[PDB]
Design a binder for these strands. Structure first.
Lengths: 190, 190, 190, 190
DNA sequence: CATGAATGAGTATTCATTCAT
DNA sequence: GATGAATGAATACTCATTCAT
């Protein structure tokens, strides 16, 4: 909405990344944004609204940037390949946000996460939309359950990423694109 | 011995956390559920957290063993993998309250509970590593395959499928998804 | 600046501890006595103990400085001792609530409050050492006198007299006991 | 009374001297007495009675041992001499009790300490007896306020002793007897 | 638009005491 | 008389949210 809306959201990322979720009270977020406590409530109406809006904004930029890149290739093998690239690229490009989103937000309470889960519905559409365009043009098993095939895909990508942050980003995440991508299409078999 | 009140308390804790949440499971509430006084809890446990540790150890400390128990009743590696999915899903489908506790409510930890959960988790992860290396060494799986990467695919997929089934309050039959998930892990999307 | 609420708290705490005791002066009770919310207390203080310490410091941290400044207005060393007794008794007789809190209530502390009291107490012991050394260096007190033992006799005599006065509910003139006490510390029983 | 009555009181001294006052729960005292927690209530009314009785029993002996020793004397300042001597000798001969009395009981709530000095009036009366006897036979000056001179003597002896335990009995308490005594009779002057 | 001082609900844990056996 | 398992009352501190300037 306003110009402080972005100072706050970006502060919340940098407050949570450095201090951790349970050490990110409103006042610590405020001081990092150069803003008073009650001013937070002029731009958001909850601590929860701050956290969800953080996710919505960052997720919107995330899915939009991916769908943009897939719009070029017309062929569903590369569309998956591009997805895996872009997913890993964006997270490798911002370690701080990765920490907040893969680690500290996991330490949330339960209905903040159910809300975060609703924000993920957008990405899961892009996945499910890909999985049905791969069935009609017959790139995938033509009796594929898309609900499950989506969950295998996100589950894998999210696990591989989460383990990358717990190792403190020691290794080149994007170097794993080809092996992960090849795994999703082919499976474990020889 | 431990006496009936020990079991009473762990049972009470499981279902309280399951109806109310991790952050709404005050000790008095658990004690009322167990039919004992607040201070009686501390005659069987050190902390509230020791209740939460014992809970996870009793209810999930044989989880991996049980999977291992049935995998050993099969020769073919690809069937072992299927049994692994089947026993992973069967055990969680068999206790809805526990499924809610361990997949949702109790992942919000960062304390010693987080330590103890990772002990059990690690055990599950080596069984995956062993199954993968066996399927590897014996030509079931392609050999340029990376174990730690394939391990993250399998667990990422299963845990995702499970957590989704829990968020939709255990409606659909999780055990019916064993066969579809299995052939996805083996033969990929293509 | 500390702001008006600072010593509203410090004062109200004296009143509560003097009327209920060290063991029944809860934060909420002090808070209401000060006319502020419980949390507001922690805006001007760190702990309950920081309150007790700040209480003792303000109310008793100039106790020795004050005695000292009246002793300076005398040249006779025996007259300085009479002034010391007079000023010791004067200050406590002038604040019955602070006397109850200091002689009976804050004694039973075991923590850092005790460290800060021993600081204030030690300075007083120094003043007694200092005086006693002047006395025997100039022939007022007998040459073979032990300072630490004499410091112990004086303090113990004053402390006992003050304490019994506080326990008989402060209802007899304390300062009227200066002359006989002073005469006893000088001439003994004979 | 009973046989366990004495085991309990002695265990109370042992626990309090070893763990301090704030770590002397009834269970610890029962365990040192070789009895059950509930057995203590077959001999005392409560934990406060255990403490009061402990003082009564130790005080009663302490006063009699002094009283009978003075009965074997003629001169009154010779009686004051054995008082200071026997007072210091009984405390010097039982260190762990002297920690309980001079240290740890001072850390108790006030309205138990006010029960402690009702016990003490027996001893104080003994002093009042000595002081008035000394007045008649002309041993002391005779507008001596016995009520006040009582508070000097006890106040001194107690402070001298309390400092001895504050320093782990690093020095011989009994070598102080006549330096202390001389002070009581002769005061500070040459 | 912005401030930041005030608010006040919420909770794990200890321990003296009881009573069924 | 002895037991000891069970009881339950009692209390400091945090932090998201407001509202008076």
């Amino acid at each position: 909405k306003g110009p402080k809306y972005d100072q706050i959201i970006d502060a919340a990322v940098q407050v949570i990344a450095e201090h951790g979720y349970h050490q990110a009270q409103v006042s610590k977020i405020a001081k990092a944004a150069g803003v008073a406590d009650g001013t937070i409530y002029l731009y958001f109406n909850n601590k929860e609204d701050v956290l969800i809006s953080l996710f919505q904004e960052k997720m919107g930029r995330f899915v939009d940037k991916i769908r943009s890149q897939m719009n070029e290739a017309t062929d569903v093998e590369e569309k998956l390949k591009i997805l895996v690239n872009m997913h890993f690229k964006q997270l490798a490009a911002d370690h701080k946000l990765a920490i907040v989103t893969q680690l500290e937000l996991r330490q949330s309470n339960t209905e903040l996460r159910l809300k975060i889960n609703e924000v993920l519905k957008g990405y899961l559409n892009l996945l499910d939309e890909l999985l049905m365009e791969g069935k009609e043009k017959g790139y995938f098993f033509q009796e594929l359950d898309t609900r499950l095939a989506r969950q295998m895909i996100f589950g894998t990508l999210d696990e591989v990423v989460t383990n990358w942050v717990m190792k403190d980003c020691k290794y080149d995440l994007t170097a794993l694109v080809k092996p992960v991508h090849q795994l999703l299409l082919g499976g474990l078999r020889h």
